[PDB]
Amino acid sequence: ETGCLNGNPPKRLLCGGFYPRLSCCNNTECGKLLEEIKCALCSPHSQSLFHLVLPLLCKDYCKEFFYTCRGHIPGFLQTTADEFCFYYARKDGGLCFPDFPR
């Protein structure tokens, strides 16, 4: 199931706080969330995470991201969390971002 957005699968050993052993590679709370989402490219399931360009978000994390970054991101005041997560969160509850413990 693992796969990088590159051609080759991940390599076991820089986003090391999220994917230390194997990978593909503001002071606000929204900034920390933007760091986490930034490190989604280095995920071993990044090819499956990417099927605003964001990985398939978990529902709870999608609500948390929307409410935490609303007002800092253009257009988040122009939509509800239900529609935003309807477009960006994964529905089946399977493999979603974040795919690391938190």
Cβ neighbour number for residue 77 with a 10 Å cutoff:
8
Comparing CA positions, the residue from 60, 69, 68 lying closest to residue 89 is: 60
Helix ranges (H only) for the chain are 29-38, 46-49, 59-69, 81-88
* Distances from the Cα of 26 to the Cα of 1, 30, 67, 85, 100, angstroms: 34, 8, 16, 24, 22
Comparing CA positions, the residue from 17, 28, 34, 11 lying closest to residue 100 is: 17
Left, alpha or beta for 72 (phi > 0: left; psi -120 to 50: alpha)? alpha
N- to C-terminal Cα separation, the chain:
22
Residue 7 backbone dihedrals phi, psi, to 5 degrees: -85, -35
Here the tokens at position 2 are 């693992």
The DSSP 8-state label assigned to residue 80 in this structure reads: -
Q: Is the dihedral of CA 40, 43, 45, 46 positive or negative?
A: positive
